[PDB]
Structures are given as C-alpha cells and as structure tokens.
Write a protein that binds this ligand. Structure first.
Ligand code: NAP
Lengths: 49, 145, 998, 168, 242, 96
C-alpha cells in the first residue's frame, strides 16, 4: 500500500480521479433526480407516464 | 422588548400618567441594528432629531406587535412616521448585560430660554446666528477637500 | 413556473389591530392640525369608519385625553379637531360592542381619456358627476340603462365633520330601491336563475334582494364578522386587492396569498391591515402559486391544521380564487406553454382548491359550514381577440353548476359565480369610449363593492339553496359585435393621436424654416437643475415672545444655569452614514438630494474637482472611479441603486472585515494518510523559536558521513495548518461599503496604526464639533480652562480588532504591529481624541456598560459637569463587529440565526423586528456616536446650538454582578416616590411657590 | 432512551452522570442561569427532534420515557458530533473511532448496540487531556466498558516474517 | 503557560515522493471548504470506502513552540482556591478567574466594615442607593483567550464565554451574588489608573445624591495574551537581562 | 374517467384535459401554421368538435365537463381571431 502511493507520485498518476469523477457524477444525479421527482410530485405519475 | 415595555408601563402607571395618554415607542434599531456599545448614543442621537423636528419615526419593520404587549396600555408601537405638532420630552432607556440599565430623558430646548432675560436671549440669538454660518462654511470646505 | 413556492414556516399573520387603531387616530390629528386633510376631504370620514370599526374602551380613553387636551385657541385647525374629535369619541362609544361594518366612502370615479392637440394621449379617472355617493351608484345600477330597457343628500364633499355623526346611525330605508327597477328593464347588477330549459335568464325578484342588500350595505354597511375567507390573487392595485380591503373592514379572518413574496410586497400588506383591518379581523400572507398542485395540497392543510401541528386552526367560509396571469397576443397557433400553464392557475387548480377543502370539510365531519366559492367569470368567451387560453379557462367554470347538483360536495361547497365586468386597472384608454353606449364600466373599488355584496348575509342563504350567477356586467352582452366595436374605438384613438403628433411636429418644424431656429432658440427657456446644498440642522430660534410663553412665566431667574446640562452637538457613524443621512432613511424612508449626495461622498462614489478636466474648467462633483463629471441631479439616478444596495443591514461584505467569510469560518484540523515509509526532517530557517515540542526521538549519526543537517523524527506529532467550516449568523449592519476615513481628512499613518473602531470615533467627534459651531476645538479654551474640558466616552468591548491581533493573531506567526495592545483598550480610543483634537487636562473617565454604555456615559458625563469638574464633556459610545464577537453572540443564541430567517422568507432588510410577534433576536451593527454636552450658561455665552436639555440620566442595577444575559426591574427605581399621604398638596411642585422662596 | 438522555444531560453540565439524578428536573438542574436551559433543551431537540412544548419542568426520568419510545438506536447528529469530537480530540494518533469500535468487539466482544453504549458512556467521563499511547486508549476504553456494562447489567510462525524482512 | 515554551504556528520536514492524501469519517461537516476541485475521482463503486482524494499544496494543522523572556510575575500565592472562602464549585467552573478574585475581595471588604451580611445596608438606605463603581483594566482576559484565541482551536469552550469577557460583567456577579443593588451602575476602565478613576466616579456619584453607599475599586489578571503584548511594547522588565 | 369527483380530480384528469382540450386547441393551432405558410387561404379545414350537453349535469365524470364545455368558446374566436380563413368551426353533439 505504501510502495504504491509513492510510486504514483512519480507518474503523477492520480488514483482518485476514478472517484472524484464518480462523486461529482453522483451529486449531479441526486440533484438531477430532485428535479425529475418534483415533476412526478406535481404532474402525477399518470401524466408524466 | 417584553420587559422594556413592561417597565415603561409601571413608571407611567406609578407616576400617575393620564389614562389614555400613552408614550410612543420609537424603535431605532430596525434600521441600524445593535451597535453593541453605540446603542444609547444612536438613540439619544435620534431623540434630539425628534425634539427639534417633531417627527416621530416608525418601526417600518413592525409586522405585528405581540399580543402580550397589549396589557401595557401606556405605550404605542407605531409603524409609520408621525409629524407631530411638537415633542416636549423624550425618554431614552437602554439595557444590556450585567444588569446595567439606564434611562435618560431629554427636554425640549425651548423650555430653557424661558429662564433667561430677554436682552440676553436675543443676544445669544445673534451669537448663534454667526456660528451657524461659520460652521456651514467650514463643513463645506472640509467636505469638499 | 410550476416551482413550489410556499412554506408553512413562511406565513405572516397580521392581527394586532388594537394597536393600529391608536395609530390611525393619532395620525388624523397631524393631518388635520397640519391642514393636510380638510373638513371637506372624503378621507376624514373614509378613515373615521376604520377607527370606529376598531373600537375599544382603551381607544376611547385614548382619544378622550387627546381631544380634551387639544387647545382649540391655538388656531382654527385646533378647532376643527376639537369639534370633529368629540363626534368620534361619542360615535365610537355607540358602535362599541357592535360588529364592524365596511361602508365604502370613496368618490366613484369614471374613465376619462384625453388626447393633447399635441397628439399626446393620457388617461385620467376623474370623479363622476351624477354619482358622488355609493347610494347614487347602486340606484343608477338599479335603473338599468337605455340599452338595458328591453336622494338622501348628505354632506359628503361638503362637511365631513357632520357626516361623522351620521356613520353610527342606521339610516333605514323605506322606499326600497329595488322598487325603482323599471319593468322590462334589466338593472346593471342582476343575479340570474336557471330555467328548466337549461339557460340562465334574468330573474327580477331574485335580483331584487341582492340589489337592495347592496343599497342596504351602502347606507349602513355590511359586516363580515366571523367570516373565514381564502382569497388568492391580490396584487397591489388589482381586482381582489379591493375586496381584501373590504373583507378586512368587516372583521373577516382572511388568507391572502401572493406569487411574488418579497419585503415590499408585505410592507404593502402591512399597510393594508394597519389601515383597514377591524376588530377580530385577521389576514395571513403566505407565498403561493396557483399553478403548483403540490402547493394547494399544502396551503389548505396549513389552514386546516391545529395550531399545535403548526397549522392555522381555521375553517373556510368563503373562497375567492381570483389569481390569474396575463397573456395577450396569443392566438390559436401561439397557444403553448405559457397558456397551458395559465390554464392550471385558473382552472384545474381552482378545481383542486375546492377539490381539497372538501377532503378537510369531510374528515372533520363539518357539513353545516359550507364554503361559498366565488368564481371570477367573464362574458368574454372568445369574443375578444387573442387572450390565449383565457376563454375556455373561465368558460369551463360555469360547469360548476352541473356538479353542485350532480356530485357529493354540495354540503361543503356552495358555488357563487360572479363576473369580471369591465373593471379599469387590471386597455384602459377606451373605457370612456364604451360608456357612451349606455354601458357602465367599474372602478376596481366599485367592482369591489359588487363582489363584496355577494357575501351579504342575504345572498349567503340564496347561494345555499342553489348555485347563483351574479352578472355584474354593465350590459356589455348587449352592445353587439363588441370586438371590433372595441377595436375601432382604439384604432381611432391612435389616429387622432398620431396625426396630431405628426402635424404638430412638422408645423413646429415649418416654423423653424421660415423663421429659423436662430431666433427660435431664445424661446427654448433655460431650465435649472437644483444643486445639493447640505445643511447643519441647527435648531430654529423662534422670537423671544414665543418662547417666554411656552415656559412658565415664573421660570426666569429661577434656574442656576451653571447646573442645567445641555447637549450642544452630536454626530454619528452608522450603517447609514452620519446623523443627517440616517434621520432621512429613519423619518422619511428615502434619501433627499442632500442625502443622496452625502451618501455618495461618504461611500466614495463621487469626488470633488476644480481646475481643468477635459481642458474645460470643471467645478463640482465627479465620478471617483472614472473621474467623469456628474451633476448632483443625475446622482440619485446613477447611484441610489448601489448606495441602498450597500448600506444598512446587509449580507455581510467580507472585504470590510479583511476576509471574514461567514460561510468559511476557519478552525483547526488534521488530514489524510499514505503508504508507510516516513521519517521526517526540517530545514534551515526558523530553528530558533521553534525547537521544544518533540523530545529525544532521533536516529542520530554524529559522524560527518552525511553532509546536510536536519532534525530527524517520526510519527506522533500534532501540526500546522488551520482549516474551515460553515456558520449561520450571516448579516450585520455594516457601515456603507466603501467608507474610508481618508475621505474625512484622517491621515494615512493613523489608519495604519490605529484600530478601526477608533478610526470611527474620530470621524464622529469632528462632526460632533462641526455640528456644534465649534469648528476648531481650541475655541473652547477661549471661554473655559484647559482643565475643564472633559471626556466621558466609552465602548463595549472596544478594539476587538486588536484583541484579535494579540489573543488570536500573534500566535499565528504573522506580522502584528508591536504597538498592538495599546489599541485594544477602551481608555485608548478616547485617547486619540485628546491626542489628535482636544488637548484636554484631567483624570478622564471611561464607562463600559456592555450595551448601555452610551447612557452611562451621559450619566457620568452629567454628574461630572454639575459636580464642577468640567464645563464641557464629550459623552457617547462606540463599538465594532468582527467574528470574534459575532460567533460568541451566536452560541449565546442572542443574535437572530440567519438561515432560519431565510426559511421564514424574511429578508436582510427586515431581520431586525423590535417589539414584534415573530422577533427572534437582534442584529449587531458597528459604528460610533457621540455628543458634546455643556453647562447651560456656558452655552449661552459661547453661542452654540443648544439641542436638548438632559434633565435626567441614571443607570440602575439589581445587586452584585450575578447573571448577565437577563434584564430586570432596574430602572423602575427612577420613579421611586411615596404616595402614602397624597391628600394634601405638595407646595414644592408649584413654581409660583418656589419663586416666592427664591 | 434513558442512557442517551442522562449522558447528554451531563455532557452539557460538565458534571459526571452520578451528580445528575434522573428524578430531578432540568429547571432545578440548571441552577437558574437559563442560558444553559435553552442550550440543553436545544441540544436534545436536534438529537430527538421530538419534544413536548414545555419540557423544562418535566423530570429527567419523566422526560426520558417519551424519548425512549420514539428513539430507536438512532444515535442522532448531536450525539454523533459529540462522540466524534471526543475520539478526535482525546485519543492518540492513529487511534480513530473505527479502531476503538473494533477493539471493543474484539478484546471485549460487544456489538454496535453495546459498542455505542460504551462509547456514549465514555463521553460522560472524558479524560482532561489527550491520551498518550494505544495502551492508555485501550485501558480507558476498557475502564469505561466496566461502567457501561454495569450501567446496564451485562457482565463478561516467524520466519514468514524474518525473510519477509531481509529483502526489505 | 510555560514562558520557556510559548506556542506558535509552524510546519515540518519532508519524505520520498509517493503521496495522495485521504480523509476519515468524523468531522466532514464543518470542515470541507479549503481545497477546491483537486481529486482523481472514480464514481464507479469498484472501491468500497470513501475519502476525499487530494495532493500536495495545502497548509495544515499542528501548532508549535518557541522561547520567551518575560519570565516572572507576582502571582497570587500558589495554591489559592476560592473554595477556601466559601465560593461554590459551580461558579468557579462558570466564572472567569478575575471575577473569582473580585468576589473574595468584596466579602472581605464588607467583613472589614462591620457589614457581615450585605442586606443590613438596606436597613438604613433604599435598595436603589447602594451603588457600584468598580472597574478593571482589560478584565476577563482569560475569556478573551477563550473566544478570540481558544474557540477556533477546536476545543470545548463554555458557550457562555462572552459574558465573562466584559468589565461590566465582573461587578455583575457582585450584585448577582451579594448585594441586590438597583440602578444604572457605572464601570470605569482606566488602563492602569482605573482604581483612582473608580474612586472619582464613586465620589461624584455619592455627593450627587445618586447613592449613599458605593463600591469602588479595581482588578485585573495576568496571562500570556497580556504579558507578551507588554513584552513587545518593551514595557515590562526583560527578565533574562535581569 | 368515472368515479372522479371534485376531491378526486388529479393526474388522470389533468391528463385527460389535455387529450381533449388543450391539444385539440393545439391541433387547430398548428394546422394554421401550415395553412398560412403555404399561403393556403381558400381551402379551410372544417373542425368538428365533439361537444355534449353534459356540463356537470351527470355525476362524477371527472374533468370531462369543463373540457367539452370550454369548446364552445371556439366561436368567440372564429370571429375574434385571425385563423378564420383556415379553420371553420362546426360544433357537434355527443347525444346518447
Ligand atoms: N378585470 C377584469 O376585467 C376581469 C374580468 C373577468 C375576470 N377577472 C378576474 O379578476 C381576477 C382578479 O384579478 P384581476 O384579474 O382582476 O387582476 P389581476 O391583476 O389579473 O390579478 C392577478 C394576480 O394574480 C396573482 N398571480 C399571478 N400569477 C400567479 C400564480 N402563478 N400563482 C399565484 N398567483 C398568481 C398575482 O398576485 P400577485 O400580484 O401578488 O402576484 C396577481 O396580482 C382574476 O382572477 C381574473 O380572472 C377580471
């Protein structure tokens, strides 16, 4: 686990963009759902459907 | 405000203020806020604006004075300005931490000149008239430069 | 636009009528004795009813003392209130204990469009001539019109004082005005009645008891006590803004909703209730939109929930869903989103308002208190042009009768259709055109009267047997082919307007080529822009005869003037600038010209300049950023937006507090981890202070085989990077953003050496002397010894920006000026005043009363002076605001949490609500304020502006310093007197007795 | 419910849980300085959200009953915050909450429910200074375990590394 | 406070390069707005436990220490507890040390006046004629240390802390615990001549007629926030050169 | 939709209102755009609105009434608006 990280210092290979991507991809899904269920909460799941 | 209003009531209730003659609540802090220490000097500052203007400002942020304040029949709580025919005295009360209270009342300046002889008054009158002009001059030079 | 906009926590209940009644009355005094209102004005009676409606035994005593003490001999206006008042004090004594009515008094006005021969069009609503009462209106409403064919004369506009006596008397009718309905003649306001064929025909009897109830409602007025009303769509100057004023006068308990919730929209509604709302009347202003189903599924729950669940505890007795959005220019190929939205605001949600008060009517089991609905209908069913889907919206509302009989909600809802007739306000320039076709058009206050008579206790039953329609249309269903009949009346008003625009300009242009503009320029008159001429507001000195009269005659020679304290100057540095430019936004609510130039100069917007800029000699105000000349007449337009944007209680601007960003409060933390291979070294810089943490934890090699030297260590330390995290108390009343002392004449060294708070205090002391006719402080020494000019100023904490420097900043290892402790004091803030202005000469006191320092300062200031220690004393107070202080006040829970004010839909400029039902705490501001107080006789021989007479100042406390954050009785002791024996008279209170002894 | 309540009622009063009996009421408890009363009631409000309107007179034991039922093992935000600070502030480096929780279920074998109790009981008796070594942390946790347990009544080869070293 | 170890703010020594740096699951809540968008995210669940992923370029979190000179002051005798005088245990835990001194001196000042219980004053004088004109220098410097310096160190500070920092609120506990006096009650702050000013306002208060009895006097404390400031002013005697 | 009275008017109705009203409006509102772009003004499209006498006279049909009642407002417009040359309304009746 150690020799890994210091070795990633050298290639400047970020081990955590694979999560920063995934984390920002996630909250802009929650706030994207937050819209998409406001409409079903106000148009009704019979109208939207 | 529950307490400050409370205490004003008794000191008018006790002093025999005429029933149905309430004092008029001026709440300066709606504009400015609470200048923790500067308070009583903003509200004494305004209280002098009033004696010479006769214009009682109002709590332009008073939605709804609390019902619990109705029992204090010796105090109003305005919300619009009130150009009176002349205020004769203003009381400035203030409260803060540590149980330091404090109430200062101001009288209208014109009651003073009733205590001096005439020739002395209009003598003083001319004296101020000159100072006013000079103060006007100096205030404008400095304001400019 | 379907976005949810209502919060249960966002309501706003207005009920304190018992107060506004004593306000509205007192307000009358100071219009009448100031001749703002005359004995002939319609408002004196249109207001006297609003105060009668709010009658109590307390209010009777309020006007008894006020009237009985109004000395009429002071002037004729003093007689006008002495006589009018006594009517109210006897009128209000009758209508006490009777339900409050509204009785609309305004002069009904008709439309009047006039085009200049210059070709300029203008609309005016002048007072009609044939109808000057409301009874005159309801009769010309009864007589119908010449197309609808197939007098208690009072002192209204003559003497309003004698009409006041007529308000409480029930002027009963004998000849019912429903008799004046001619046969074969349809009146203007008729109810309707379904015929077994299916249509709706004018019924005469059923339209008789409506129409006389109106005429009854116009002489005696109608009461709505115990009503409970929902009413949506009530913008300022709109259809149902005037029914609200009527609902409230009657004593209704109302819910009004708004789509645009802000502060000017509620300060509107506050002024509505403070004027109109009568005893027991109550209005709630909630935010809302009709077009959100999730928002009607939540407003009625809020009205049908107990005051324990946070609800309202009410039960609706009438619904008035008027709310609509405009759309014009939308024809059939343009019908889209905005219309499909408007259809929901008007139809399918007025359907789900009724469809959802039943669910609450029926769950409680309420079936004897049905809610009358008032559908705003219209005769415009695709008869006008392209209004969008506004037709099949309001046309598919009379289908609300095919259901009151068909469906199950008959017991809880009772339909009472209505009519948008032709109400002017909200196309207004052709109203005067149509009225020539024997058609009536309504002012909003007039159509207010009609829909409001649709609640009369008579009709309420009539709705409660059958759904009623109430054609409040002036007859506009009779003028045939009205569309282009309308479209022609205005197409002509643009011709006659534009041709007199074109003919007028060319003849004026013709006049410029036969005579030439060389002589026509002398006719272009020179018109002058006012300039800003600030003033000092010295007290005016009325002549000696006037003042020897106001004081008792025995007073002269009776006072030791050496012992009469007197304020002589004052000044201030607040969130609104000086004491001249706060008294404006205090008393007058908005800035003058002299107030907008001063707030422009002390915020560093405008500068001065004389000399030559752009070559030309410019002398006067100029931009300060661009340096481009600006006149004081175009300053209120150019800057007033930002001046008000950056003054007073505001969202805290961080650069006024050197990086304090309340959303990033900085604190102390640690970070994330690695793969294990680590001893840890140092460098060659700060080994000198920083060497006594660790201990003996090295793997030394003192043999030179290495070469460069650094302490060798390992895991187990605690170290060195601060961190950040959020906070809530988020607004404070800054000084106007941009305030520099440099503007006042304070040197650049001092500001770099002195603490901000003292930098405020100097500015206020110069202006306080400026304000006293003392332009250079040494003139004091012409009259008084250098040792008799005192100072009794003090702060709260004071210097909190320096305490921040030593108790918090210094151990952060950053450059702090080593004189830093000297400024932290409270003693050393009134020091620079003496160090830079006065050169005064004693032991000089300094109060610190945490918040009541500025009255204590006057207390010690006065006792200093009449002790004999000083002839002149500076008193006053000052303090600052930074995060070391606010955060402490935060966790005390003393200042109002701001996030829970952004969830009460409160706005920055309103979060300081003193003496208010929904008060939550206070708002700390920053600044100073001082004033020069002197002996009296010194002020008279010095010749200074005497502003006041501090006749008493006294601080008070219970006992030992025991528990700070709670106030108490303390000051009540300033009234300690003994009433054990009051039967005899106390001679000392008389002056005629004290004068004889003297 | 009683556990959390009592523990949270002593953390804001800088006194140990024994000094505060459940039978008394907060009104007496505060001493008067009503500034703490509002904070004490506010601290519990966020850690329970549910409250009667006037709790200041309801005894500790009486006020706990109402909270004991509603609350179900949900340690709450306030409690979570408080515990986090405790472990953060006063526990040696590398000895995070996870390690402490794991040790409790390993060296004493307590589940989350029992583990939380021990950690919640540790707050009442916080050490006045940061503990030095893992031993101190382990001892402190073990010492607190007894109290927590009593408060409820529930008593309780090498060469693979030698050469693994040599190449390093 | 160990004047040979005055604590301050510094940074440490270096390693061999392989390092991104994570976090744990405890105080994410106040503490989340330093860095910026500086991660190598992977929002695809292939990992399992979650911690903000970052790199070099921060400034962080351990104070440090270094020496000082002003090394003596006239302490109260080592071992002085108020408990000895009858001051409760709550108050000492709630009140700032300086006020804890001031109470002890006011009882003894009444002891020294034949007034053993303060209420006997009220046998002769009205409750509103017993004043107080006491004041301090800085006052409460142990509390200012708590809010202006301690609170952002992230350690438990009693939330009533601002109330003690005042100078008004040190003669408050005197009234709150002994006197039950009754007006607007003054409080001088003359940086070093407060205790004569206190007598000045105290006397003029009394022959004004405001009060028949007045407590006057003065008080202050000593800690490093104060001495170090006085050090760099070069006002108090350097001790090493002594 | 049947069984839908005033407190049951919701999604399914607010949907049915669009099938019947606001889209029969946008059918006509959108053959004009094509009538008018070609310039066709001598071949108008007769509309046949299916109306009914049931305007809330029957029981709980849902929002079926103010749907088909707000279609005779299609005469207040053939005279008012501009699409008279391309569309000619010819109301009708759902009898029984
Ligand atoms: N005037 C006529 O000749 C006539 C004829 C027939 C019918 N009417 C009826 O008159 C009624 C009363 O108003 P008005 O038309 O006379 O004047 P109006 O100015 O149309 O009244 C409009 C009110 O609608 C509210 N509003 C707008 N959009 C909203 C939304 N999305 N959600 C909630 N509220 C919204 C607004 O309240 P805020 O302004 O506070 O946002 C606005 O003031 C209307 O209901 C209309 O149907 C009038």
């Amino acid at each position: 686990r150690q020799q890994l990280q210091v070795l990633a210092r050298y290639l400047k290979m970020d081990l955590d963009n694979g999560e920063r991507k995934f984390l920002k991809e996630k909250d802009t899904v929650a706030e994207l759902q937050a819209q998409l269920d406001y409409l079903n909460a106000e148009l009704g799941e019979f109208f939207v459907n | 405000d529950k307490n400050e209003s409370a205490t004003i009531n008794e000191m008018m209730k006790h002093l025999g203020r005429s029933e149905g003659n309430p004092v008029i609540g001026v709440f300066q802090k709606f504009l400015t806020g609470h200048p923790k220490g500067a308070a009583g000097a903003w509200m004494m500052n305004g209280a002098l604006q009033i004696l010479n203007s006769g214009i009682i400002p109002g709590n332009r942020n008073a939605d709804n004075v609390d019902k619990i304040l109705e029992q204090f029949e010796y105090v109003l709580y305005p919300s619009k300005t009130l150009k009176t025919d002349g205020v004769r005295a203003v009381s400035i009360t203030s409260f803060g931490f540590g149980q330091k209270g404090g109430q200062a009342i101001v009288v209208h300046p014109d009651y003073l000149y009733g205590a001096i002889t005439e020739d002395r008054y209009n003598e003083y009158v001319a004296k101020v008239s000159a100072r006013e002009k000079s103060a006007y001059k100096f205030f404008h030079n400095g304001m400019i430069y | 636009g379907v976005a949810t906009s209502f919060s249960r926590k966002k309501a706003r209940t207005f009920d304190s009528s018992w107060n506004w009644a004593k306000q509205s009355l007192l307000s009358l005094y100071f219009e009448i004795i100031h001749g703002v209102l005359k004995n002939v004005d319609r408002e004196v009676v249109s207001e006297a009813i609003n105060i009668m409606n709010r009658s109590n035994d307390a209010l009777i005593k309020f006007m008894e003392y006020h009237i009985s003490n109004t000395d009429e001999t002071k002037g004729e206006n003093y007689q006008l209130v002495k006589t009018l008042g006594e009517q109210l004090i006897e009128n209000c004594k009758q209508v006490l204990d009777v339900d409050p009515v509204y009785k609309d008094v305004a002069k009904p006005t008709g439309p009047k469009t006039a085009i200049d021969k210059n070709g300029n069009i203008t609309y005016s609503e002048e007072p009609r001539e044939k109808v000057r009462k409301l009874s005159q209106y309801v009769q010309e409403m009864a007589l119908g019109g010449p197309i609808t064919k197939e007098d208690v004369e009072d002192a209204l506009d003559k003497d309003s004082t004698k009409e006041v006596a007529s308000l409480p008397n029930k002027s009963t009718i004998s000849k019912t005005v429903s008799s004046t309905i001619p046969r074969e003649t349809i009146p203007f306001l008729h109810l309707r009645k379904k015929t077994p064929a299916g249509d709706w025909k004018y019924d005469r009897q059923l339209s008789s008891l409506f129409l006389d109830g109106l005429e009854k409602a116009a002489f005696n007025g109608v009461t709505f006590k115990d009503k409970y009303v929902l009413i949506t769509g009530a913008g300022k100057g709109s259809i149902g803004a005037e029914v609200l004023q009527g609902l409230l006068q009657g004593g209704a308990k109302v819910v009004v909703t708004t789509s645009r919730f802000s502060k000017q929209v509620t300060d509107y509604y506050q002024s509505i209730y403070a004027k109109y709302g009568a005893k027991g009347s109550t209005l709630i202003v909630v935010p809302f939109n009709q077009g959100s189903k999730q928002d009607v599924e939540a407003l009625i729950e809020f009205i049908y929930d107990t005051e324990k669940n946070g609800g309202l505890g009410w039960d609706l007795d009438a619904i008035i869903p008027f709310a609509a959005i405009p759309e014009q220019g939308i024809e059939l190929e343009h019908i889209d989103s905005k219309s499909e939205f408007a259809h929901r605001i008007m139809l399918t949600n007025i359907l789900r308002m009724m469809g959802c008060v039943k669910k609450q009517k029926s769950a409680r089991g309420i079936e004897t208190r049905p809610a009358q609905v008032i559908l705003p209908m219209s005769p415009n069913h695709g008869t006008f042009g392209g209004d969008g889907m506004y037709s099949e919206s309001k046309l598919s509302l009379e289908t609300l009768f095919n259901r009151w009989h068909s469906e199950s909600w008959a017991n809880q809802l009772t339909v009472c259709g209505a009519i948008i007739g032709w109400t002017r306000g909200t196309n207004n320039i052709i109203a005067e055109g149509i009225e020539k076709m024997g058609v009536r058009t309504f002012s909003q206050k007039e159509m207010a009267f009609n829909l409001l008579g649709l609640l009369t206790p008579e009709v309420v039953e009539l709705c409660q047997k059958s759904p009623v329609m109430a054609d409040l249309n002036g007859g506009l269903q009779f003028v045939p082919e009205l569309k282009e009949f309308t479209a022609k009346l205005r197409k002509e008003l643009v011709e006659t307007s534009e041709v007199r625009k074109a003919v007028s300009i060319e003849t004026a242009l013709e006049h410029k080529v036969v005579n030439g503009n060389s002589a026509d320029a002398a006719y272009a008159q020179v018109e002058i822009q006012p300039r800003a001429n600030i003033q000092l507001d010295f007290p005016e000195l009325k002549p000696y005869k006037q003042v020897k009269q106001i004081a008792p005659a025995e007073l002269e020679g009776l006072l030791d003037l050496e012992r009469v304290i007197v304020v002589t100057g004052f000044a201030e540095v607040g969130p609104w600038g000086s004491a001249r430019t706060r008294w404006e936004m205090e008393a007058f609510g908005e800035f003058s010209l002299e107030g907008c130039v001063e707030m422009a100069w002390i915020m560093g917007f405008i500068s001065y300049h004389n000399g030559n800029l752009k070559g030309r000699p410019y002398t006067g105000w100029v931009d300060s950023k661009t340096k481009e000349p600006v006149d004081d007449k175009d300053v209120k337009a150019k800057y007033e937006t930002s001046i008000l944007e950056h003054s007073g209680i505001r969202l805290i601007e961080p650069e006024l507090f050197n990086g304090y960003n309340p959303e990033k409060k900085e604190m102390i933390q640690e970070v994330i981890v690695e793969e294990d291979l680590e001893p840890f070294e140092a460098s060659k810089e700060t080994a000198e202070q920083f060497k006594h943490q660790h201990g003996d934890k090295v793997d030394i090699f003192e043999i030179p085989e290495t070469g460069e030297y650094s302490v060798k260590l390992l895991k187990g330390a605690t170290l060195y990077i601060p961190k950040a995290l959020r906070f809530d108390r988020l607004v404070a009343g800054q000084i106007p953003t941009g305030w520099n002392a440099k503007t006042y004449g304070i040197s650049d060294d001092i500001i770099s050496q002195v603490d901000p708070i003292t930098l405020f205090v100097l500015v206020s002391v110069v202006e306080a002397f400026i304000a006293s006719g003392i332009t250079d402080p040494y003139e004091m020494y012409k009259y008084v010894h250098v040792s008799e000019v005192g100072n009794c100023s003090g702060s709260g904490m004071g210097g909190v920006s320096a305490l921040r420097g030593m108790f918090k900043d210094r151990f952060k290892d950053e450059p702090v000026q080593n004189d830093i402790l000297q400024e932290s004091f409270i003693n050393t803030m009134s020091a620079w005043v003496n160090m830079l202005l006065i050169s005064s000469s004693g032991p000089i006191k300094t109060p610190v009363g945490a918040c009541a320092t500025s009255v204590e300062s006057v207390d010690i200031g006065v006792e200093t002076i009449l002790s004999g220690k000083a002839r002149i004393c500076i008193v006053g107070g000052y303090d600052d605001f930074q995060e070391e202080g606010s955060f402490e006040f935060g966790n005390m829970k003393a200042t109002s949490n701001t996030l829970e004010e952004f969830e009460h839909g409160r706005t920055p400029a309103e979060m300081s609500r003193p003496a208010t039902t929904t008060r939550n705490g206070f708002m700390e501001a920053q600044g100073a304020g001082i004033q020069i107080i002197m002996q009296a006789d010194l002020a008279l021989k010095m010749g200074v502006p005497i502003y006041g007479i501090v006749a008493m100042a006294a601080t008070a406390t219970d006992k030992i310093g025991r528990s700070v954050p709670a106030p108490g009785k303390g000051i009540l002791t300033t009234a300690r007197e003994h009433h054990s024996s009051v039967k005899y008279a106390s001679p000392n209170l008389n002056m005629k007795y004290r004068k004889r002894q003297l | 419910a009683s556990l959390l309540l009592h523990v949270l009622v002593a953390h804001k009063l800088k006194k140990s849980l024994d000094s505060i009996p459940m039978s008394k009421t907060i009104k007496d408890l505060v001493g008067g300085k009503s500034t703490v009363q509002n904070e004490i009631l506010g601290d519990l409000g966020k850690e329970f959200g549910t409250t009667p309107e006037k709790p200041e007179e309801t005894p500790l034991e009486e006020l706990a009953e109402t909270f004991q039922d509603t609350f179900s093992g949900a340690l709450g935000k306030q409690s979570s915050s408080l515990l986090s600070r405790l472990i953060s502030s006063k526990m040696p480096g590398g000895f995070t909450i996870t390690v402490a929780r794991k040790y409790l279920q390993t060296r004493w074998g307590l589940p989350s429910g029992r583990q939380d109790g021990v950690l919640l009981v540790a707050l009442s008796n916080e050490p006045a200074a940061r503990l030095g070594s893992e031993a101190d942390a382990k001892a402190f946790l073990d010492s607190m375990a007894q109290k927590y347990a009593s408060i409820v009544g529930v008593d309780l080869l090498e060469e693979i590394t030698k050469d693994h070293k040599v190449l390093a």
